[PDB]
């Protein structure tokens, strides 16, 4: 259950900018960060983990200053470097604890990795324009920011993640049984097995005589359950669809055609 803090900063031009974010603990979204809001919004009753209010507000203040400072620094790099608008930057930062925890802080420009926080400073990723190599020299001057990031990844994060793991331990281990139904798709007669409403995410779906089934992508539902589709291409009887899920206490779902 790693913690993934995502950031989406869009710079249409020098006058229009948006930054939005959210936090993922495993497959669950714990926080939403709207550019139309001063503060980060908690989605779950346990979203605050074990951190106290004074603690949580401290982090809250850091994000305010960081959002404001981040966007102005980008604009100044645009001038100095100098880069053409529109610009789009993405940040992926967080950690996951183990029985030694690991942390990360990557930034992408135009959908490509440009740099990550490594050790105590900023470093260019392998695929990075020469200008990124220059923007680093400027960033590495800011010793304080360099310590805050170091402390946020190595100290703050692992603690906050441990707090979330226990505060929301029951909803993380929660089980939700999926409902299933069959249908006849567009003829290549291809049989379709639908499986929606299951949580957690891991699932098993196959057409039974095991067959050469083609499982689709695990799509999300609005309520945080998942949807899946398994199709089999056969000539137009005894065929079955089997569903194995943790919510199914050994009681596999079985639907005959």
């Amino acid at each position: 259950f790693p913690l993934r803090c995502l950031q989406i900063s869009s710079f249409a031009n020098s006058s229009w900018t948006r930054t939005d974010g959210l936090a993922w603990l495993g497959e669950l979204q714990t926080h939403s960060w709207s550019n139309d809001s001063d503060t980060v919004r908690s989605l779950k009753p346990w979203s605050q983990g074990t951190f106290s209010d004074q603690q949580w507000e401290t982090l809250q203040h850091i994000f305010r200053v960081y959002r404001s400072s981040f966007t102005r620094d980008v604009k100044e790099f645009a001038k100095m470097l100098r880069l053409s608008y529109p610009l789009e930057l993405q940040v992926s930062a967080g950690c996951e604890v183990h029985p030694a925890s690991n942390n990360f802080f990557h930034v992408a420009f135009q959908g490509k990795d440009i740099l990550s926080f490594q050790g105590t400073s900023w470093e260019p990723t392998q695929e990075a324009p020469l200008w990124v190599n220059l923007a680093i020299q400027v960033l590495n001057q800011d010793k304080w920011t360099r310590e805050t990031v170091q402390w946020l990844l190595n100290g703050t994060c692992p603690q906050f993640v441990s707090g979330l793991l226990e505060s929301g331990k029951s909803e993380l281990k929660k089980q939700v049984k999926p409902k299933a139904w069959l249908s006849r798709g567009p003829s290549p007669l291809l049989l379709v097995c639908h499986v929606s409403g299951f949580y957690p995410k891991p699932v098993w779906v196959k057409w039974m005589r095991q067959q050469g089934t083609q499982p689709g992508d695990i799509l999300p539902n609005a309520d945080e359950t998942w949807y899946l589709r398994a199709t089999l291409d056969v000539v137009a009887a005894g065929l079955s669809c089997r569903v194995k899920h943790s919510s199914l206490e050994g009681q596999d779902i079985v639907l005959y055609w």
Partner: T-cell receptor
Amino acid sequence: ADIYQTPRYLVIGTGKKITLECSQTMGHDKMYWYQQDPGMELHLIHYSYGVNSTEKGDLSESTVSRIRTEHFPLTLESARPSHTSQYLCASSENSGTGRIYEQYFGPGTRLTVTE
Amino acid sequence: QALSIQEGENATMNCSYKTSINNLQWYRQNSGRGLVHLILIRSNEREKHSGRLRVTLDTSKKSSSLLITASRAADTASYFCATYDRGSTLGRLYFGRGTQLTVWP
């Protein structure tokens, strides 16, 4: 040191083209222009990261050029009485040379625009 | 702002900012001249000394004071407080109004 400005003083007619000179022999990539009312709050009107860098500040009708490190000339397309004030030129040390936070100023230009 | 004191007396000037700052610095100006940097205090510092002047920084109340001991005619000038909001060269120096200090005989 140091940084130099000419002219110290100047009185000109409304609507004339003015060019305020600022030079610096310290090798500072970063330079700034300020508009000041006597003893009043300073307003950054232009700044530069280096050669070819010409950025507008939080403040009027004027432009700058940075063809060379040493020179950061300010031009007043037209002159209205509103342009009556002090014009300060400043620079800041390069990273790796000295502390980058302070700004070094010139003598300034006391400009009066009369009707 | 304006402050008038007598030679030998101590002068104290107040300054306050709003946002987060990396460091705070005081300047002085004289008639027909440009600003001269006097002293710099970082956000993680509370007091700094140099010659006859001392700066104090209260990040909590977000304000600073400049003390000049043994005021001397030479101290007569305009004093400005300016904040710097970055730990790099992308920083912005923000100046305050500036108070006229005159040391009389």
